[PDB]
Design an enzyme around this catalytic site. Sequence first.
Site, PDB file in Angstrom:
ATOM      1  N   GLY A  22       0.815  -1.198   0.000  1.00 32.25           N
ATOM      2  CA  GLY A  22       0.000   0.000   0.000  1.00 32.25           C
ATOM      3  C   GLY A  22       0.851   1.251   0.000  1.00 32.25           C
ATOM      4  O   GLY A  22       2.085   1.201  -0.038  1.00 32.25           O
ATOM      5  N   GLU A  23       0.151   2.384   0.012  1.00 30.16           N
ATOM      6  CA  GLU A  23       0.757   3.702   0.144  1.00 30.16           C
ATOM      7  C   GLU A  23       0.634   4.128   1.597  1.00 30.16           C
ATOM      8  O   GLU A  23      -0.481   4.256   2.118  1.00 30.16           O
ATOM      9  CB  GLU A  23       0.073   4.739  -0.752  1.00 30.16           C
ATOM     10  CG  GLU A  23       0.028   4.391  -2.217  1.00 30.16           C
ATOM     11  CD  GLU A  23       1.403   4.234  -2.810  1.00 30.16           C
ATOM     12  OE1 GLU A  23       2.308   5.009  -2.415  1.00 30.16           O
ATOM     13  OE2 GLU A  23       1.573   3.330  -3.664  1.00 30.16           O
ATOM     14  N   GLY A  24       1.768   4.352   2.250  1.00 35.34           N
ATOM     15  CA  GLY A  24       1.784   4.792   3.623  1.00 35.34           C
ATOM     16  C   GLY A  24       1.946   6.296   3.742  1.00 35.34           C
ATOM     17  O   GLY A  24       1.991   7.034   2.760  1.00 35.34           O
ATOM     18  N   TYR A  26       4.588   7.599   4.495  1.00 30.56           N
ATOM     19  CA  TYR A  26       5.921   7.932   4.009  1.00 30.56           C
ATOM     20  C   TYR A  26       6.136   7.629   2.531  1.00 30.56           C
ATOM     21  O   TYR A  26       7.067   8.183   1.936  1.00 30.56           O
ATOM     22  CB  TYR A  26       6.992   7.195   4.837  1.00 30.56           C
ATOM     23  CG  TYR A  26       7.050   7.629   6.296  1.00 30.56           C
ATOM     24  CD1 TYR A  26       6.182   7.085   7.235  1.00 30.56           C
ATOM     25  CD2 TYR A  26       7.968   8.586   6.725  1.00 30.56           C
ATOM     26  CE1 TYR A  26       6.220   7.485   8.563  1.00 30.56           C
ATOM     27  CE2 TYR A  26       8.026   8.989   8.045  1.00 30.56           C
ATOM     28  CZ  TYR A  26       7.145   8.439   8.964  1.00 30.56           C
ATOM     29  OH  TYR A  26       7.187   8.828  10.280  1.00 30.56           O
ATOM     30  N   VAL A  29       4.831   0.919   0.482  1.00 30.21           N
ATOM     31  CA  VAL A  29       5.123  -0.180   1.394  1.00 30.21           C
ATOM     32  C   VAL A  29       4.942  -1.486   0.642  1.00 30.21           C
ATOM     33  O   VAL A  29       3.904  -1.701   0.003  1.00 30.21           O
ATOM     34  CB  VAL A  29       4.235  -0.151   2.650  1.00 30.21           C
ATOM     35  CG1 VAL A  29       4.548  -1.351   3.528  1.00 30.21           C
ATOM     36  CG2 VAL A  29       4.464   1.145   3.429  1.00 30.21           C
ATOM     37  N   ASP A 139       0.212  10.507  17.820  1.00 30.20           N
ATOM     38  CA  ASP A 139      -0.660  10.201  16.684  1.00 30.20           C
ATOM     39  C   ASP A 139      -1.189   8.779  16.796  1.00 30.20           C
ATOM     40  O   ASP A 139      -1.247   8.039  15.805  1.00 30.20           O
ATOM     41  CB  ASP A 139       0.053  10.402  15.338  1.00 30.20           C
ATOM     42  CG  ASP A 139      -0.916  10.586  14.189  1.00 30.20           C
ATOM     43  OD1 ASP A 139      -2.114  10.900  14.445  1.00 30.20           O
ATOM     44  OD2 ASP A 139      -0.487  10.397  13.022  1.00 30.20           O
TER      45      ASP A 139
HETATM   46  N1  DU8 Z   1       0.713   2.374   5.312  1.00 33.58           N
HETATM   47  N2  DU8 Z   1       0.699   1.995   4.487  1.00 33.58           N
HETATM   48  N3  DU8 Z   1       0.730   1.648   3.717  1.00 33.58           N
HETATM   49  C1  DU8 Z   1      -0.169   0.551   3.504  1.00 33.58           C
HETATM   50  C2  DU8 Z   1       0.179  -0.654   4.310  1.00 33.58           C
HETATM   51  O1  DU8 Z   1       1.279  -0.556   4.995  1.00 33.58           O
HETATM   52  C3  DU8 Z   1       1.009  -1.586   5.890  1.00 33.58           C
HETATM   53  N4  DU8 Z   1       2.104  -1.765   6.757  1.00 33.58           N
HETATM   54  C4  DU8 Z   1       2.819  -0.887   7.367  1.00 33.58           C
HETATM   55  S1  DU8 Z   1       2.427   0.842   7.172  1.00 33.58           S
HETATM   56  C5  DU8 Z   1       3.273   1.662   8.507  1.00 33.58           C
HETATM   57  C6  DU8 Z   1       2.601   2.998   8.832  1.00 33.58           C
HETATM   58  C7  DU8 Z   1       2.711   3.930   7.608  1.00 33.58           C
HETATM   59  O2  DU8 Z   1       3.785   3.889   7.043  1.00 33.58           O
HETATM   60  O3  DU8 Z   1       1.748   4.642   7.292  1.00 33.58           O
HETATM   61  N5  DU8 Z   1       3.748  -1.486   8.061  1.00 33.58           N
HETATM   62  C8  DU8 Z   1       3.592  -2.780   7.872  1.00 33.58           C
HETATM   63  C9  DU8 Z   1       4.220  -3.852   8.322  1.00 33.58           C
HETATM   64  N6  DU8 Z   1       5.221  -3.686   9.133  1.00 33.58           N
HETATM   65  N7  DU8 Z   1       3.833  -5.047   7.933  1.00 33.58           N
HETATM   66  C10 DU8 Z   1       2.794  -5.209   7.110  1.00 33.58           C
HETATM   67  N8  DU8 Z   1       2.182  -4.134   6.646  1.00 33.58           N
HETATM   68  C11 DU8 Z   1       2.584  -2.944   7.043  1.00 33.58           C
HETATM   69  C12 DU8 Z   1      -0.226  -1.042   6.576  1.00 33.58           C
HETATM   70  O4  DU8 Z   1      -1.051  -1.958   7.211  1.00 33.58           O
HETATM   71  C13 DU8 Z   1      -0.882  -0.582   5.303  1.00 33.58           C
HETATM   72  O5  DU8 Z   1      -1.771  -1.470   4.816  1.00 33.58           O
END
Ligand code: DU8
Length: 341
Positions: A22-24, A26, A29, A139
Amino acid sequence: PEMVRGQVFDVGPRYTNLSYIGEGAYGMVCSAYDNLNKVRVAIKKISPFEHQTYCQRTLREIKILLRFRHENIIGINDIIRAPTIEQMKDVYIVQDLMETDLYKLLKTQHLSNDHICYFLYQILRGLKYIHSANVLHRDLKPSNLLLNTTCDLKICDFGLARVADPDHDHTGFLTEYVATRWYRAPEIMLNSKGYTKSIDIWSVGCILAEMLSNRPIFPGKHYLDQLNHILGILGSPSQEDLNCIINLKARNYLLSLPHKNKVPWNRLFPNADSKALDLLDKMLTFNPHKRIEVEQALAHPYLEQYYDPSDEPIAEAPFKFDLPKEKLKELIFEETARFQP
Ligand SMILES: [N-]=[N+]=NC[C@H]1O[C@@H](n2c(SCCC(=O)O)nc3c(N)ncnc32)[C@H](O)[C@@H]1O
């Protein structure tokens, strides 16, 4: 370099077989296969170096997560970047792969009381450690609570965190942009910069309410709406609680409102455990000075099956206490050196 969705995702050769997640907050991801540890991991691509505020938040996240070590806080397993500052354009943070997060889970799954209890225990256990380090997360919300397949919960995203500063918490009315709107304590809109630990407890209370019903309890449609929602449930603050707000603009705003009665928690949540609602009430207390603290919350009867202070560790080394992006890039480069390579 291997690519995902058209942009560079340059993590090889240790990490292969990438999948877009996904798009986080930052950037992109992905999951990936860790050829050394022989397990699939999460990798976050961060591209902060053009903007001082992005550099700030990235440095915050890295510095805090590298010092913290706690079962209920996501760790950093590895950091990938170029060998030289000149060549460094992106930074990849490698973390344990988590099945889901509480935001995604609440979209489609009803939680048992046992799951609510377990999740809340783990949130507060992690928060106890964060606060014992003199750090505010600032947050907390469902999407910053990661869960693996066995429902182990880890707090993530420390980009907005700060060292607590209660002596400088006071400010004027309708300033301040702390936390994500729905999880923002009432005093943020009244007279607080969000520099005290009670800001986080409010957010946890909002998360508990949302676990009980799968709906955000205070869904403010915009910044100004948020206080309307909070007061519509808590009702009008007492004279004693108003007397604690010395700022006249904030106090007179509250005095200008018609009287509102408190909505009983058990009418909002008729199927909830009564002990959970008692704890909810103490976390969602209007006056931040009367609001329950994290160690009291852990000792609340709702959590009696899990409570064990000797197994709720604190930080060894609390954090005790402007920079152009160039200095920040150099600081990020230095902070990530231990992973070279
Ligand atoms: N976000 N985003 N992007 C989309 C996906 O990023 C997934 N995700 C993150 S996100 C961290 C917070 C951020 O960076 O916002 N860390 C992890 C992780 N460690 N293992 C699995 N999934 C992760 C989140 O559930 C979301 O579905």
